[PDB]
Amino acid sequence: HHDGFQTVKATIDWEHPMFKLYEKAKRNGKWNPADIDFSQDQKDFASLTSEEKISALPLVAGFSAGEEALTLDILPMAHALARQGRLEDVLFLTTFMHDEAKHVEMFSRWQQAVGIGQMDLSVFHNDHYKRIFYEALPEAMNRLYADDSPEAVIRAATVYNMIVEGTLAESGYYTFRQIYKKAGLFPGLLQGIDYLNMDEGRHIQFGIYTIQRIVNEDERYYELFIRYMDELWPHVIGYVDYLTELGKRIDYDLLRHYVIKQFNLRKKQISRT
Amino acid sequence: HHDGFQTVKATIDWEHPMFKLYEKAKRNGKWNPADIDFSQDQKDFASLTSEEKISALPLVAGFSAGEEALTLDILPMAHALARQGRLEDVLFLTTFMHDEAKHVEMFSRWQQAVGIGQMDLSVFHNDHYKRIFYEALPEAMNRLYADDSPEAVIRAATVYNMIVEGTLAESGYYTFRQIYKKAGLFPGLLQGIDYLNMDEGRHIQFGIYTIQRIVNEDERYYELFIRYMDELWPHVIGYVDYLTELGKIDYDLLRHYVIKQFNLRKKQISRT
Ligand SMILES: CCCCCCCCCCCC(=O)O
Ligand SMILES: CCCCCCCCCCCC(=O)O
Ligand SMILES: [Fe+2]
Ligand SMILES: [Fe+2]
Ligand SMILES: [Fe+2]
Ligand SMILES: [Fe+2]
Ligand SMILES: [Mn+2]
Ligand SMILES: [Mn+2]
């Protein structure tokens, strides 16, 4: 039941940082996956040999499931914040959810255009990927439906925004650029990564804001954050190591360093105070 | 746990009705309430006498809370359809939810701009309004977290889309355009309501699709639908009586429009 409603008793808190992020989202989130021209990606992918074709599919496999997972699995967080009456957070999170929807859309349109929609790409999800995306992500998020304690929220934001988005996805978009922008391939996909990467800059700020406002209330949660971050690293690097051993069948060692740098960069964006 | 992912094993169902609605929402849902100029609404409202001022507030009280409730209360529908694997529905529902947020945002900006933001407008929610918006809507939606049965999804769509949106809000925005476009008042608010009314045309199609695809399985659900509508009617009309009495403009035109809207919704679902 609703006790009452903030916009009948008062107003939106116009100064709230998440309301300010919501405003920037509507401003900067107008791109439409449907408007991306994929006709050259179609040609590029066709003129690839069968061996140069496989090279692209693992990254794509991780993005398409990842974004679909991201779209489904933000709903518990939106629910938990709404129940706590953090209305500006909810407003913003509508833009987050609809961004992820566009992310899933873009990757699927790409698959359709280049002619692999009928192909099952689950075979490039190794155990470590499954542990993050099939299991640890929805488990941490669905927890919020019955346990919205600071500890559960910090863990949801850590898995979702700091590890999946902030470490894995940031690194894979960097990687996709590294490899394909230089080879001059898949411009429609690269336009779409570009849009996606701008969206995700907002998503991470919500994750930082959420972890930090929980840390601010009790510095003991800073150690929970660092700990959960470290608990997921083995699967982060286990997914990375698997992708490397596939591509090795392109400086993998400067991609591996970027994943590590991203991981440590996220850590340093939360302070104990 | 995720069993797998549709866009790794296959693709989006590009021909699904809710994906087509999703595609349309993106095309047609670009408005930003931050861009509406409310400077004249401020002046108009200040030009009103104290008695004229309070004549506007109950309808605004109904709208602001209603859009707030609607933003919060679609989330369980998103979850339950997501849990059933209806990805294209979920994609659409992201545009539905972001629309409602813009709707709440608009009315709050209007209250801020005309200088009534500090004023608690709950006083204009009577017992019938509270029955619907504080209680029945959130009960119906939250049910879906533990009971996604046909009966539960029908009852959620019936209350959310068919009564709240399709009967009460449709009639309210009709009511407001009629009174204030004729008075030449609140041009920024009226512009936001035009935008809102376009959004909401997509929303009602999702609710029609949802209720009819379930009814299509079993015509026992058509009778469930009709009953859930009639169950809510005494509160719809009780709130309409409350506002008309407050006001006391052709009140009987407006009141008959609500009944029209309610019958209209009934007739958008067919037994087969
Ligand atoms: C050695 C490869 C380095 C790149 C690692 C990033 C892999 C992550 C793929 C994207 C997963 C996702 O967020 O959807
Ligand atoms: C004077 C006749 C009243 C017409 C119905 C007005 C109902 C207004 C409340 C709408 C709230 C909402 O569903 O967002
Ligand atoms: Fe994201
Ligand atoms: Fe391993
Ligand atoms: Fe709506
Ligand atoms: Fe009554
Ligand atoms: Mn994304
Ligand atoms: Mn609305």
CA distance linking residue A101 with residue A116, whole number of Å: 20
Q: Which domains does chain A have, with CATH numbers?
A: 1-273 (1.10.620.20)
Which residues of chain A does B139 touch, with a Cβ-Cβ cutoff of 8 Å?
1
| B47 contacts: CB under 8 Å, gap ≥ 6 | none
Distance B239 CA to ligand 2 centre (A): 8
CA distance linking residue A186 with residue A123, whole number of Å: 22
**A contact residues 53-82, partner B, Cβ 8 Å cutoff:** 61, 64-65, 67-69, 71-72, 75-76, 78-79, 82
Confirm or reject contact between A108 and chain B (CB < 8 A): yes
Is residue A138 within 8 A of residue A73, CB to CB? The reply is yes
CA Rg, chain A, in Å?
19
* Ordered alpha helix ranges (H), chain A: 6-9, 17-28, 39-47, 50-54, 57-73, 75-83, 87-114, 127-129, 137-143, 150-157, 170-176, 182-183, 187-217, 220-247, 252-267
- Cβ <8 Å between B5 and A135: no
The alpha-carbon gap from A108 to the nearest alpha carbon of chain B, in Å, equals 6
**Resolution to one decimal, Å:** 2.0
Backbone angles phi, psi at A106, to 5 degrees: -65, -45
CA distance linking residue A56 with residue A211, whole number of Å: 34
Largest CA distance in chain B: 64
Distance B240 CA to ligand 6 centre (A): 10
- Cβ <8 Å between A8 and B32: no
CA distance linking residue A66 with residue A129, whole number of Å: 9
Extract the tokens encoding B80. 């339950």
Extract the tokens encoding B150. 């046909």
Cβ of residue B168 lying under 6 Å from some atom of ligand 2: yes
Which numbered ligand comes closest to the C-alpha of B200?
5
Which numbered ligand comes closest to the C-alpha of A205?
3
Please give all residues whose beta carbon lies within 6 A of any atom in ligand 1, as ranges: A 59, 62-63, 66, 164, 168-169, 171-172, 175, 240, 243-244, 252, 255-256, 259
